[PDB]
Design a protein around this motif. Sequence first.
Motif, PDB file in Angstrom:
ATOM      1  N   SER A 228       7.324  -1.400   1.841  1.00  0.00           N
ATOM      2  CA  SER A 228       8.592  -0.797   1.454  1.00  0.00           C
ATOM      3  C   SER A 228       8.818  -0.821  -0.053  1.00  0.00           C
ATOM      4  CB  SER A 228       9.748  -1.501   2.168  1.00  0.00           C
ATOM      5  OG  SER A 228       9.665  -1.324   3.571  1.00  0.00           O
ATOM      6  N   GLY A 229       7.815  -1.219  -0.830  1.00  0.00           N
ATOM      7  CA  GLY A 229       7.950  -1.272  -2.272  1.00  0.00           C
ATOM      8  C   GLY A 229       6.755  -1.897  -2.959  1.00  0.00           C
ATOM      9  N   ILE A 230       6.553  -1.565  -4.233  1.00  0.00           N
ATOM     10  CA  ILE A 230       5.424  -2.081  -4.999  1.00  0.00           C
ATOM     11  C   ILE A 230       5.782  -3.434  -5.601  1.00  0.00           C
ATOM     12  CG2 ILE A 230       4.276   0.108  -5.466  1.00  0.00           C
ATOM     13  CD1 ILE A 230       5.833   0.186  -8.135  1.00  0.00           C
TER      14      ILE A 230
ATOM     15  N   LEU B 129      -5.273  -5.563  -4.795  1.00  0.00           N
ATOM     16  CA  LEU B 129      -5.905  -4.838  -3.697  1.00  0.00           C
ATOM     17  C   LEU B 129      -4.895  -4.490  -2.610  1.00  0.00           C
ATOM     18  CD1 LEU B 129      -9.239  -6.858  -3.382  1.00  0.00           C
ATOM     19  CD2 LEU B 129      -8.970  -4.536  -4.280  1.00  0.00           C
ATOM     20  N   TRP B 130      -3.942  -5.388  -2.347  1.00  0.00           N
ATOM     21  CA  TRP B 130      -2.935  -5.118  -1.326  1.00  0.00           C
ATOM     22  C   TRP B 130      -1.973  -4.022  -1.762  1.00  0.00           C
ATOM     23  CZ3 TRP B 130      -1.485 -10.865   0.186  1.00  0.00           C
ATOM     24  CH2 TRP B 130      -2.578 -11.420   0.864  1.00  0.00           C
ATOM     25  N   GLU B 131      -1.732  -3.891  -3.069  1.00  0.00           N
ATOM     26  CA  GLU B 131      -0.873  -2.818  -3.557  1.00  0.00           C
ATOM     27  C   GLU B 131      -1.566  -1.465  -3.470  1.00  0.00           C
ATOM     28  OE1 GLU B 131       0.464  -3.435  -7.532  1.00  0.00           O
ATOM     29  OE2 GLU B 131       1.827  -1.713  -7.535  1.00  0.00           O
ATOM     30  N   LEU B 132      -2.887  -1.434  -3.663  1.00  0.00           N
ATOM     31  CA  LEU B 132      -3.630  -0.182  -3.573  1.00  0.00           C
ATOM     32  C   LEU B 132      -3.755   0.313  -2.138  1.00  0.00           C
ATOM     33  CD1 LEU B 132      -5.202   1.857  -5.366  1.00  0.00           C
ATOM     34  CD2 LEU B 132      -7.266   0.520  -4.888  1.00  0.00           C
ATOM     35  N   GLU B 133      -3.585  -0.570  -1.150  1.00  0.00           N
ATOM     36  CA  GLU B 133      -3.691  -0.154   0.244  1.00  0.00           C
ATOM     37  C   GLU B 133      -2.591   0.829   0.626  1.00  0.00           C
ATOM     38  OE1 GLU B 133      -3.726  -3.690   2.584  1.00  0.00           O
ATOM     39  OE2 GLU B 133      -5.794  -4.220   2.070  1.00  0.00           O
ATOM     40  N   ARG B 134      -1.421   0.731  -0.008  1.00  0.00           N
ATOM     41  CA  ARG B 134      -0.333   1.660   0.262  1.00  0.00           C
ATOM     42  C   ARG B 134      -0.459   2.963  -0.516  1.00  0.00           C
ATOM     43  NH1 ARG B 134      -0.196  -2.909   3.225  1.00  0.00           N
ATOM     44  NH2 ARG B 134       1.692  -2.994   4.526  1.00  0.00           N
ATOM     45  N   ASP B 135      -1.447   3.076  -1.401  1.00  0.00           N
ATOM     46  CA  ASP B 135      -1.696   4.302  -2.146  1.00  0.00           C
ATOM     47  C   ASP B 135      -2.723   5.199  -1.467  1.00  0.00           C
ATOM     48  OD1 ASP B 135      -0.938   5.504  -4.912  1.00  0.00           O
ATOM     49  OD2 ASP B 135      -3.121   5.718  -4.858  1.00  0.00           O
TER      50      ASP B 135
ATOM     51  N   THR C 145      -8.233 -17.025  -8.462  1.00  0.00           N
ATOM     52  CA  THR C 145      -8.803 -15.682  -8.446  1.00  0.00           C
ATOM     53  C   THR C 145      -7.987 -14.727  -7.582  1.00  0.00           C
ATOM     54  OG1 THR C 145     -10.308 -16.240  -6.633  1.00  0.00           O
ATOM     55  CG2 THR C 145     -11.095 -16.599  -8.882  1.00  0.00           C
ATOM     56  N   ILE C 146      -6.714 -15.049  -7.332  1.00  0.00           N
ATOM     57  CA  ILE C 146      -5.862 -14.189  -6.513  1.00  0.00           C
ATOM     58  C   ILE C 146      -5.267 -13.034  -7.301  1.00  0.00           C
ATOM     59  CG2 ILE C 146      -3.614 -15.271  -6.857  1.00  0.00           C
ATOM     60  CD1 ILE C 146      -3.327 -15.206  -3.747  1.00  0.00           C
ATOM     61  N   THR C 147      -5.448 -13.014  -8.625  1.00  0.00           N
ATOM     62  CA  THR C 147      -4.908 -11.923  -9.431  1.00  0.00           C
ATOM     63  C   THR C 147      -5.524 -10.583  -9.048  1.00  0.00           C
ATOM     64  OG1 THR C 147      -6.540 -12.294 -11.181  1.00  0.00           O
ATOM     65  CG2 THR C 147      -4.463 -13.506 -11.322  1.00  0.00           C
ATOM     66  N   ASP C 148      -6.747 -10.594  -8.521  1.00  0.00           N
ATOM     67  CA  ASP C 148      -7.386  -9.371  -8.054  1.00  0.00           C
ATOM     68  C   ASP C 148      -7.057  -9.056  -6.602  1.00  0.00           C
ATOM     69  OD1 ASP C 148      -9.548  -7.230  -8.707  1.00  0.00           O
ATOM     70  OD2 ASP C 148     -10.244  -8.098  -6.815  1.00  0.00           O
ATOM     71  N   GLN C 149      -6.816 -10.080  -5.780  1.00  0.00           N
ATOM     72  CA  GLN C 149      -6.506  -9.844  -4.374  1.00  0.00           C
ATOM     73  C   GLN C 149      -5.119  -9.236  -4.207  1.00  0.00           C
ATOM     74  OE1 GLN C 149      -6.842 -13.348  -1.942  1.00  0.00           O
ATOM     75  NE2 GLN C 149      -6.517 -12.242  -0.015  1.00  0.00           N
ATOM     76  N   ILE C 150      -4.174  -9.611  -5.072  1.00  0.00           N
ATOM     77  CA  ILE C 150      -2.828  -9.056  -4.988  1.00  0.00           C
ATOM     78  C   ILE C 150      -2.841  -7.572  -5.337  1.00  0.00           C
ATOM     79  CG2 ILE C 150      -0.489  -9.202  -5.916  1.00  0.00           C
ATOM     80  CD1 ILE C 150      -1.057 -12.210  -6.403  1.00  0.00           C
TER      81      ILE C 150
END
Lengths: 47, 50, 453, 295
Positions: free
Chosen positions: C352-354, C388-394, C381-386
């Motif tokens: 529902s939001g970025i 990735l989850w935002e790109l899933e909604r794109d 190393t979670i700075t890259d995993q977060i």
Amino acid sequence: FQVTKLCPFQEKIRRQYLSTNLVSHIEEMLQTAYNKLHTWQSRRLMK
Amino acid sequence: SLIRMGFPQHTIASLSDQDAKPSFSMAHLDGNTEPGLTLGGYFCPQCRAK
Amino acid sequence: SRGLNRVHLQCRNLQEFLGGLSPGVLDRLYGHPATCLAVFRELPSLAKNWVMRMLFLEQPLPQAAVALWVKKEFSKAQEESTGLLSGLRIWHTQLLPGGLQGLILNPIFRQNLRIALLGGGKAWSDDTSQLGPDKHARDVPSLDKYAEERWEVVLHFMVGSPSAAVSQDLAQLLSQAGLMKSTEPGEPPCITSAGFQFLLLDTPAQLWYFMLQYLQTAQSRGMDLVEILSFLFQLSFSTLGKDYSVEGMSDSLLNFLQHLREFGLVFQRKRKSRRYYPTRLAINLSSGVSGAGGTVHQPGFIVVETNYRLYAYTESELQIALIALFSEMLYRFPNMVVAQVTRESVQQAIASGITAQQIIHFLRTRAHPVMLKQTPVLPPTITDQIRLWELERDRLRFTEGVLYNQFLSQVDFELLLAHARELGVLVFENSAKRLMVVTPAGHSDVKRFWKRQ
Amino acid sequence: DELNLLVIVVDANPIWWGKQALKESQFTLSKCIDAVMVLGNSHLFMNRSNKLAVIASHIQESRFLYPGKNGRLGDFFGDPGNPPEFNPSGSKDGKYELLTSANEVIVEEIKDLMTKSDIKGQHTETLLAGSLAKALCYIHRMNKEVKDNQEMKSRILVIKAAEDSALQYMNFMNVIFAAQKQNILIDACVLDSDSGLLQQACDITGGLYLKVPQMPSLLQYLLWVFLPDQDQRSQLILPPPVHVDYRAACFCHRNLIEIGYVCSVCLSIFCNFSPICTTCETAFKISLPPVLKAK
Ligand SMILES: [Zn+2]
């Protein structure tokens, strides 16, 4: 010193805009060294 | 035993503006020991060497 | 940023809101209580020094004295204060009063500028709000609990009213600034993407924007009454009025007083009258742009080993309903072990939001635990995993539009691309297949250009 | 967020100010307090979390005008950074509440100083060197407490109004080097009297020796040039450039030194015409006076 100082005198006459800022820097300290030699030129006393 | 102590004086080598004047510690100045672009310096009272 | 950049800096939001006001309201704003606010909120020294120049000078000065005051090695900083000169909207450039391009300030503001610095008079010590000679004689720690209750009710509206049943109209007020979002399948509003960051820094700078929210209507509300009332709590404590405000008030002054009391900056006695006393949170509003506090030992401490990020637990009644509003985590048998299987719960809130910068801000800056005890960077190393989850909604896009196909020439399709780009209805173009997507909002205008060319 | 401090050294001399009114002057002792009334308010207008410190310079001592030394501002400080036990006046600093109380202490403290001036001890002049010795001890006490988190950027303001007396001028130079270690700036605001010792405090630390022409034109040279922010003073350029230059000569001798030598091995710089000792109890070999006396 009588022949060395004559060299820049015959060279700075072609550029008057640059020779102005080139006579107000070295003359203050050059007169002191010349004053020490001008006294012994006419000094007639060993003490 | 010691004689002749140097008592220099602080000068600015200007009158009103620093850029309007040739500044201090330049090329033609006798102070060729540490050249550059300063604002003032000392001078010997018995030799006038800035 | 989605609506919080103007909140961190106070001197920038005041200049932007002043540009869109009525000319009759700005005349009454130029008062003696407003002179000590347009300069104290600033930070650069060049923008603050020009105020004293327009006070001693009685005649307008030309721009020749300004270009010379920078001497020779200061005109670089002059261009930075040029845009700020038009923000306050108090100066005025004339034609040639004594030279060329004479700069002068509004004499209406110059008269009140000397009252709060040099000169004086009598009306300044007669009106209430701005003064109110009254001392404090009440238990201070007993009134500090009411300041926290005013902010706790707002948290209930952001979740969905779990146990509150008040009649305060605060759900629609925060929806105008992009903080609360109305639920489509239901009726209790939730929260937007920029609303998560407000529940992290906990600064009183946001309450200053809530006071000027009702003034944005520009109908029957004035700024001279709001500015003189907001100066009460800006003087820390020991600034009251006993009963002087009861004799000198009206129907408009009572409306803004009830809205400011519910925000958490001032406390009012029973029956909405008698004596009023500002809260403790109003001190940090005049101190700086942010602030901290509320703990003495910091029992919370996260983990920097694995990747599910074990959030802190056991604190107070504030972090209980705060983590569930973020992404609704889980809890096990002991003292509410929050965030232990974070893999699907975070993705439910990101649909529902970025909300990507608010989770990192809550993970890094929650109570300053690791940056004080340990030394390396807090996130592993979670700075890259977060990201990735935002790109899933794109991966998809839900938008409507029309497509034009079957043309004839190649040079003719290039002219049509400029028609939808200038109007602002173009989304994607394709010069290899002669295809253009046009939004249905401007469909009645694109078809006219094709029939004429 | 940020605090500042301004130490004003007022040269309150009843002898000089008492004779200036006879020469048809509009800026007398009653108007000298107005300078603190304006500078003290303009300093708090830029930041309401500032502090004020005014030190006087009387012919007998350097009385503290704000805060005073009496039982009101001596033991208990009326600074804005002390909410407890001080909040009827230290709460509305945004106008004329705490600013008026700051000037009221100066008027209350000067009451005991003006009445204690019977001038029965002939003339002693103003001990100007003892004024700066009290400013360094005050800025160091507050810096030890504010060194955490905050920094407190302050300056030193000196207002000269008269000459000196029979005091040793060496004590006036000890406060100059003691202030360079703390990286502080020292100013100077002369009015009529001129001295070569105060100008040294502006050249060593990098201050500005400003010369005030007429007296009523004082509010202009103390707000922009003598700004406690000292952030844009490097590119300000408002007072005229320094033309004259006064330094130091001999210590216990009546001559201008430029190549002279000390007495022997001490520090009393004298002259080169000294084969033996002068005013000490040392000695000196005769391996140099026979050389310098010849030429
Ligand atoms: Zn000796």
